[PDB]
């Protein structure tokens, strides 16, 4: 049944670094042969491609590091995902998944299987075990994995109820070593929930998936790319303001990269993560000094980065894009932001991928600053080269701020600033907003770390060994804010609440003209107004639209994890405990912007909740609609009756 | 009458830093209301735009620094200039001017009013008080303004005929501090006349004025841009050769700027001008280090500069320009130099302003090397960011040499070198040229500095306080050169005399192939030749066509300042005393090139002398016609009968 399919899906993720020792899994893997049948998949091309990869010494063996930002790794993972996705029936998909689990590389199998599960018509609504639990090596410092393995080695017969079911109290990166100050925001950048958010966003909309083939173009994906990255940057800026940090550092490709990253994580094969030192020179000569290369295109990541940056600048200035036809494509269309997002991201929907390329891929390779692989099968990728650990690197935020500057330039040059009438909602007036005291504190979070040790077959079958990891994760006391609206008739409005800063780290007031980009979508719902006075009450545990529209969320929770506050993986999901940025004992001061507008339903492609169905969104206004473009008159945003600015102090206790 | 209108115009410029305390001015400003009438201006859009700027907290208040190179400053100044210019009758223009004087920012009002006056149909022929007298803070070191204010504070009742009508003997920049050696040519770069020349040129052809709307396209403006800047550079090179300096330094955007600028001027609000230190790094990181920015496009002036330089290189190499249509526009047309000038300058006539942009604006922002403004209303611009003080900075000359290199490349690649027939004037022979001994010396120049102090209302009304500034300004003994021509029939010829160097700072002879760009237009007149022998006699006080064609000049002098040697402001005007470059006691050796050609009248758009009427010019040959393009055979220029090279030594005495 659906419950049994869910349980089997979860079973498939146990002890990924080891072969599946379940009897059914072993039998299925040893007896099944995808190429032998070759008829149960909707397409024979996908199976033929995967067979070509698998047989003729062009496949990533078990035990090798997998990176989705390496070309051949990506090609093989795509082939496996297509094999999983084009299974005519779920039974064939399960047999293929079991075989791949037992035979295909661990990281490659995990990525292909996850993308298939979120994207398959049948298994879209399947919950997935938290990634930080499945593959913990990417989420905890090696001082935690090594301690878990200490307990595992010591747990043998003697000393019962000792070295078992033990809680490892992990610290964040800067506890032991005095790492670079930017890594002081380690409890946020290295939070398992935030990295899970980024990883699940990339699972939902992979940078290599084509919107024509996989229906991701009905979700725009360019506006998604832009809005998701801008919201991540804005939430990071809010956290930095909380901790007294300033705006994210600006960096030049031609100046030594002033920031260094010292990861504390380790690969399951005993290989430590690459380290980027302070003031690292990013030039071909310096970042390939003392290396072989010769036929590695990533060795020249600097020249490719400069080329793609130049091309993006040119297309944004002109507003005219080059296509394979070499013709003139208008970028001023209604969906010009979408075209720009596809162009910059590098997804198969890019106007000309050969010309604009994957700027982010080469930027991550260069800023990761690790040795170029001697061979395909001997690769040493950095944090920036994985989705699960990208947010841990400050260079991640600096790189994507450099990217979003391009979108800001496009909007500034080609978008007309909103006037009073465009934002006006005649007959609606937000009288005042009451928000309960916003308090943020730290609490311990317990996660099943047992997947980081090597279990014996009996232990595997019975899960006898248990080892937890406890981590201080920011949490907030539940709050409920009220919105009072005085309408003129029974209209159907859309309410959009934003969270942004009012004062910078130096206490200076930030004008909306230089502050529109720092606003974080706090809630985005639809309310049916009535003539006269209305009161809108919203709880903290009812907000599912943080920095992202998730309208069909919680119906998947009520089914999969609804058989509380359990890692969803449904849509993207920002941690409910990280919604409010850390405050101060005195209370760092932010402001909430409340907006109300008439309903504009989105062009939903289909009713079924699914990636690419278009059912995600609330309204058809541009994402972050009031602040999606530069603001030329702050007093205009203050004077709108259907708007309201309200100031709150978030209090940190601990 | 015209005389009374002139006197009122001059009255409007008294004590700009203070409110006008004239009774009529106060009454007009307090009673008048431009928005209240809103019908006396030819367009209601201009008044509505200025009202929007003025009311809703988006206007530059009194006392704030104004810079025409800041985007919003420029927009507001344009709005005010359009309000002044579209006054249906002169009376409305005067009322608006009085109101703006009393209410609008001082610098913004001064700029808008001046541009309107030079460009208005009615007041084109109005003389303007010298800019170095109206706003002296941009023309004298603060050691002069502070001394004038010393005298003003001390002048109170006691000590009559003492601290009044006093002459302040000012020195140039390098008198006190041992500033960088390039600032040794301070008596020229910081001359009030030269800076007035540049400021009045920019008033006459602003970089933001559209030739379609304001008829500046009938003056080409691209050839004007090129020729004016090239002639300025050539005159500077002549001065450098006089003082033993060499060619203007070449600089790379990617290497630290080896030259530093230490201005000695101060803003009227007590703020000292920005200083650029030696070997200043121009990279985003270095020139924004320790600054806020975040929504300042000028913070990324380096990337914009690189982009626009790349685009200009590409368009010059291709000879094909990108337009909003994204189509192919031939740059090889007869008016291809004009198109290139509009493209590089960035005026609204640019083929695609979004793509090529204002390279000069961002170059000035970057090379000025000052703190980016925290806010619109708190700005700290450099010398390069004003027209009145641009020529004081060596980076000005280096920047514009870097620009003119682009035009040189365009001409070298796409223009065919002149042959003997193209330059030939059959039947005409320049027998020999006699030039009287050219002597240059220094003399004191007295300017009314009283506008730099704060006067009481009675002092304002009666101008009781007087304080002069005396400065050693280069002057030359009057000379008269003779040109002998042996024609074959009574033809109507055009005579073009050039001044250029013969020997560099090291005594080496400069070949015309590497010397055509260094020739300064000395005179450019038309003479009606007669059959046989002719003699042409021209005085020094009859030359009005120095580095610029001014045919309709001196008829405005005979009317406005003709009711001698008074600051004209009419057309551009190179100081009559700076025509001859400083010599040496032994006598630095230059050469005069005399050219004669058949008359080619210019395509004058209208007879009335006016900016954009096309009446400026003498002939229709390309500006600097013999030397407008590279020279492939110097012996060709020597062999032309209608040409003549003559060597002169200019003797410095003092």
PDB file of C-alpha atoms in Angstrom, chain B residues 178-326:
ATOM      1  CA  UNK B 178      55.417  69.517  -2.275  1.00  0.00           C
ATOM      2  CA  UNK B 179      52.631  67.936  -4.313  1.00  0.00           C
ATOM      3  CA  UNK B 180      53.138  65.340  -7.066  1.00  0.00           C
ATOM      4  CA  UNK B 181      55.275  66.688  -9.951  1.00  0.00           C
ATOM      5  CA  UNK B 182      52.451  66.497 -12.509  1.00  0.00           C
ATOM      6  CA  UNK B 183      50.813  69.327 -10.559  1.00  0.00           C
ATOM      7  CA  UNK B 184      53.764  71.560 -11.479  1.00  0.00           C
ATOM      8  CA  UNK B 185      51.709  72.826 -14.445  1.00  0.00           C
ATOM      9  CA  UNK B 186      49.343  74.415 -11.952  1.00  0.00           C
ATOM     10  CA  UNK B 187      49.345  77.904 -13.457  1.00  0.00           C
ATOM     11  CA  UNK B 188      47.761  76.350 -16.568  1.00  0.00           C
ATOM     12  CA  UNK B 189      45.659  73.464 -15.253  1.00  0.00           C
ATOM     13  CA  UNK B 190      44.362  75.636 -12.397  1.00  0.00           C
ATOM     14  CA  UNK B 191      44.057  78.809 -14.471  1.00  0.00           C
ATOM     15  CA  UNK B 192      40.623  80.356 -14.030  1.00  0.00           C
ATOM     16  CA  UNK B 193      40.359  81.006 -17.765  1.00  0.00           C
ATOM     17  CA  UNK B 194      41.072  77.423 -18.837  1.00  0.00           C
ATOM     18  CA  UNK B 195      38.630  75.948 -16.326  1.00  0.00           C
ATOM     19  CA  UNK B 196      36.094  78.568 -17.402  1.00  0.00           C
ATOM     20  CA  UNK B 197      36.660  77.421 -20.990  1.00  0.00           C
ATOM     21  CA  UNK B 198      35.905  73.806 -20.108  1.00  0.00           C
ATOM     22  CA  UNK B 199      32.898  74.739 -17.957  1.00  0.00           C
ATOM     23  CA  UNK B 200      31.425  76.957 -20.674  1.00  0.00           C
ATOM     24  CA  UNK B 201      31.987  74.279 -23.308  1.00  0.00           C
ATOM     25  CA  UNK B 202      30.036  71.862 -21.119  1.00  0.00           C
ATOM     26  CA  UNK B 203      27.329  74.485 -20.613  1.00  0.00           C
ATOM     27  CA  UNK B 204      27.093  74.942 -24.380  1.00  0.00           C
ATOM     28  CA  UNK B 205      26.944  71.206 -25.207  1.00  0.00           C
ATOM     29  CA  UNK B 206      25.944  69.305 -22.055  1.00  0.00           C
ATOM     30  CA  UNK B 207      26.575  65.567 -22.029  1.00  0.00           C
ATOM     31  CA  UNK B 208      22.895  64.951 -21.193  1.00  0.00           C
ATOM     32  CA  UNK B 209      21.231  67.259 -23.731  1.00  0.00           C
ATOM     33  CA  UNK B 210      19.531  65.597 -26.693  1.00  0.00           C
ATOM     34  CA  UNK B 211      20.336  66.974 -30.129  1.00  0.00           C
ATOM     35  CA  UNK B 212      16.867  66.138 -31.418  1.00  0.00           C
ATOM     36  CA  UNK B 213      15.100  68.066 -28.649  1.00  0.00           C
ATOM     37  CA  UNK B 214      17.583  70.949 -28.304  1.00  0.00           C
ATOM     38  CA  UNK B 215      18.939  71.117 -31.876  1.00  0.00           C
ATOM     39  CA  UNK B 216      22.465  70.156 -30.798  1.00  0.00           C
ATOM     40  CA  UNK B 217      22.609  67.517 -33.549  1.00  0.00           C
ATOM     41  CA  UNK B 218      22.923  70.267 -36.175  1.00  0.00           C
ATOM     42  CA  UNK B 219      26.310  70.942 -34.544  1.00  0.00           C
ATOM     43  CA  UNK B 220      27.221  67.232 -34.835  1.00  0.00           C
ATOM     44  CA  UNK B 221      28.320  67.128 -31.156  1.00  0.00           C
ATOM     45  CA  UNK B 222      30.379  64.018 -31.837  1.00  0.00           C
ATOM     46  CA  UNK B 223      32.931  65.791 -33.938  1.00  0.00           C
ATOM     47  CA  UNK B 224      32.671  68.620 -31.401  1.00  0.00           C
ATOM     48  CA  UNK B 225      33.285  66.207 -28.521  1.00  0.00           C
ATOM     49  CA  UNK B 226      36.290  64.667 -30.282  1.00  0.00           C
ATOM     50  CA  UNK B 227      37.815  67.871 -31.588  1.00  0.00           C
ATOM     51  CA  UNK B 228      37.419  69.862 -28.383  1.00  0.00           C
ATOM     52  CA  UNK B 229      38.954  67.137 -26.233  1.00  0.00           C
ATOM     53  CA  UNK B 230      41.770  66.471 -28.706  1.00  0.00           C
ATOM     54  CA  UNK B 231      42.581  70.183 -28.903  1.00  0.00           C
ATOM     55  CA  UNK B 232      42.585  70.454 -25.106  1.00  0.00           C
ATOM     56  CA  UNK B 233      44.952  67.481 -24.948  1.00  0.00           C
ATOM     57  CA  UNK B 234      47.202  68.986 -27.630  1.00  0.00           C
ATOM     58  CA  UNK B 235      47.387  72.373 -25.898  1.00  0.00           C
ATOM     59  CA  UNK B 236      48.240  70.584 -22.655  1.00  0.00           C
ATOM     60  CA  UNK B 237      50.974  68.660 -24.470  1.00  0.00           C
ATOM     61  CA  UNK B 238      52.386  71.912 -25.842  1.00  0.00           C
ATOM     62  CA  UNK B 239      52.519  73.305 -22.311  1.00  0.00           C
ATOM     63  CA  UNK B 240      54.175  70.120 -21.039  1.00  0.00           C
ATOM     64  CA  UNK B 241      56.813  70.373 -23.767  1.00  0.00           C
ATOM     65  CA  UNK B 242      57.364  73.984 -22.724  1.00  0.00           C
ATOM     66  CA  UNK B 243      58.053  72.872 -19.143  1.00  0.00           C
ATOM     67  CA  UNK B 244      60.163  69.871 -20.154  1.00  0.00           C
ATOM     68  CA  UNK B 245      57.401  67.351 -19.506  1.00  0.00           C
ATOM     69  CA  UNK B 246      56.725  64.553 -21.964  1.00  0.00           C
ATOM     70  CA  UNK B 247      53.684  62.845 -23.398  1.00  0.00           C
ATOM     71  CA  UNK B 248      50.706  62.416 -21.092  1.00  0.00           C
ATOM     72  CA  UNK B 249      51.092  59.320 -18.938  1.00  0.00           C
ATOM     73  CA  UNK B 250      49.370  56.169 -20.136  1.00  0.00           C
ATOM     74  CA  UNK B 251      47.549  54.259 -17.411  1.00  0.00           C
ATOM     75  CA  UNK B 252      45.955  50.831 -17.120  1.00  0.00           C
ATOM     76  CA  UNK B 253      42.727  50.357 -15.192  1.00  0.00           C
ATOM     77  CA  UNK B 254      44.264  47.167 -13.763  1.00  0.00           C
ATOM     78  CA  UNK B 255      47.487  48.765 -12.447  1.00  0.00           C
ATOM     79  CA  UNK B 256      47.526  51.163  -9.464  1.00  0.00           C
ATOM     80  CA  UNK B 257      46.974  54.715 -10.682  1.00  0.00           C
ATOM     81  CA  UNK B 258      50.479  56.101 -10.368  1.00  0.00           C
ATOM     82  CA  UNK B 259      49.379  59.748 -10.172  1.00  0.00           C
ATOM     83  CA  UNK B 260      47.866  61.406  -7.116  1.00  0.00           C
ATOM     84  CA  UNK B 261      45.866  64.615  -6.805  1.00  0.00           C
ATOM     85  CA  UNK B 262      45.851  66.847  -3.715  1.00  0.00           C
ATOM     86  CA  UNK B 263      43.309  69.637  -4.259  1.00  0.00           C
ATOM     87  CA  UNK B 264      43.555  72.689  -2.028  1.00  0.00           C
ATOM     88  CA  UNK B 265      39.958  73.840  -2.569  1.00  0.00           C
ATOM     89  CA  UNK B 266      37.100  73.564  -0.088  1.00  0.00           C
ATOM     90  CA  UNK B 267      33.338  73.390  -0.378  1.00  0.00           C
ATOM     91  CA  UNK B 268      31.271  76.325   0.935  1.00  0.00           C
ATOM     92  CA  UNK B 269      29.926  74.039   3.684  1.00  0.00           C
ATOM     93  CA  UNK B 270      33.440  73.702   5.119  1.00  0.00           C
ATOM     94  CA  UNK B 271      34.130  70.322   3.488  1.00  0.00           C
ATOM     95  CA  UNK B 272      37.541  69.830   1.900  1.00  0.00           C
ATOM     96  CA  UNK B 273      37.829  68.402  -1.601  1.00  0.00           C
ATOM     97  CA  UNK B 274      38.639  64.679  -1.914  1.00  0.00           C
ATOM     98  CA  UNK B 275      42.292  63.709  -2.290  1.00  0.00           C
ATOM     99  CA  UNK B 276      43.561  60.886  -4.495  1.00  0.00           C
ATOM    100  CA  UNK B 277      46.806  59.440  -3.173  1.00  0.00           C
ATOM    101  CA  UNK B 278      49.726  58.189  -5.229  1.00  0.00           C
ATOM    102  CA  UNK B 279      49.482  54.651  -6.600  1.00  0.00           C
ATOM    103  CA  UNK B 280      45.781  54.343  -5.831  1.00  0.00           C
ATOM    104  CA  UNK B 281      44.289  50.920  -6.504  1.00  0.00           C
ATOM    105  CA  UNK B 282      41.158  51.347  -8.625  1.00  0.00           C
ATOM    106  CA  UNK B 283      39.591  47.921  -8.049  1.00  0.00           C
ATOM    107  CA  UNK B 284      36.113  47.580  -6.558  1.00  0.00           C
ATOM    108  CA  UNK B 285      37.577  46.113  -3.372  1.00  0.00           C
ATOM    109  CA  UNK B 286      40.261  48.757  -2.875  1.00  0.00           C
ATOM    110  CA  UNK B 287      38.336  51.909  -3.771  1.00  0.00           C
ATOM    111  CA  UNK B 288      35.266  50.780  -1.801  1.00  0.00           C
ATOM    112  CA  UNK B 289      37.205  49.346   1.155  1.00  0.00           C
ATOM    113  CA  UNK B 290      35.555  50.277   4.439  1.00  0.00           C
ATOM    114  CA  UNK B 291      32.371  51.664   2.886  1.00  0.00           C
ATOM    115  CA  UNK B 292      28.654  50.883   3.006  1.00  0.00           C
ATOM    116  CA  UNK B 293      27.306  51.144  -0.560  1.00  0.00           C
ATOM    117  CA  UNK B 294      24.940  48.255  -1.355  1.00  0.00           C
ATOM    118  CA  UNK B 295      22.640  50.180  -3.717  1.00  0.00           C
ATOM    119  CA  UNK B 296      25.091  52.613  -5.337  1.00  0.00           C
ATOM    120  CA  UNK B 297      25.769  51.786  -8.976  1.00  0.00           C
ATOM    121  CA  UNK B 298      28.822  54.058  -8.861  1.00  0.00           C
ATOM    122  CA  UNK B 299      30.306  51.682  -6.282  1.00  0.00           C
ATOM    123  CA  UNK B 300      30.866  49.304  -9.219  1.00  0.00           C
ATOM    124  CA  UNK B 301      32.310  52.020 -11.446  1.00  0.00           C
ATOM    125  CA  UNK B 302      35.235  49.736 -12.307  1.00  0.00           C
ATOM    126  CA  UNK B 303      33.078  46.985 -13.816  1.00  0.00           C
ATOM    127  CA  UNK B 304      30.966  49.512 -15.721  1.00  0.00           C
ATOM    128  CA  UNK B 305      34.132  51.188 -17.016  1.00  0.00           C
ATOM    129  CA  UNK B 306      35.519  47.864 -18.221  1.00  0.00           C
ATOM    130  CA  UNK B 307      32.207  46.952 -19.862  1.00  0.00           C
ATOM    131  CA  UNK B 308      31.862  50.251 -21.706  1.00  0.00           C
ATOM    132  CA  UNK B 309      35.512  50.216 -22.779  1.00  0.00           C
ATOM    133  CA  UNK B 310      35.009  46.706 -24.168  1.00  0.00           C
ATOM    134  CA  UNK B 311      31.851  47.754 -26.024  1.00  0.00           C
ATOM    135  CA  UNK B 312      33.586  50.817 -27.489  1.00  0.00           C
ATOM    136  CA  UNK B 313      36.537  48.694 -28.611  1.00  0.00           C
ATOM    137  CA  UNK B 314      34.155  46.222 -30.247  1.00  0.00           C
ATOM    138  CA  UNK B 315      32.136  48.877 -32.074  1.00  0.00           C
ATOM    139  CA  UNK B 316      35.279  50.650 -33.304  1.00  0.00           C
ATOM    140  CA  UNK B 317      36.821  47.397 -34.549  1.00  0.00           C
ATOM    141  CA  UNK B 318      33.635  46.193 -36.225  1.00  0.00           C
ATOM    142  CA  UNK B 319      32.531  49.622 -37.354  1.00  0.00           C
ATOM    143  CA  UNK B 320      29.028  48.315 -36.665  1.00  0.00           C
ATOM    144  CA  UNK B 321      26.861  49.626 -33.838  1.00  0.00           C
ATOM    145  CA  UNK B 322      24.168  47.987 -31.724  1.00  0.00           C
ATOM    146  CA  UNK B 323      20.844  49.830 -31.502  1.00  0.00           C
ATOM    147  CA  UNK B 324      17.653  49.231 -29.537  1.00  0.00           C
ATOM    148  CA  UNK B 325      16.483  47.357 -32.637  1.00  0.00           C
ATOM    149  CA  UNK B 326      19.594  45.195 -32.256  1.00  0.00           C
TER     150      UNK B 326
END
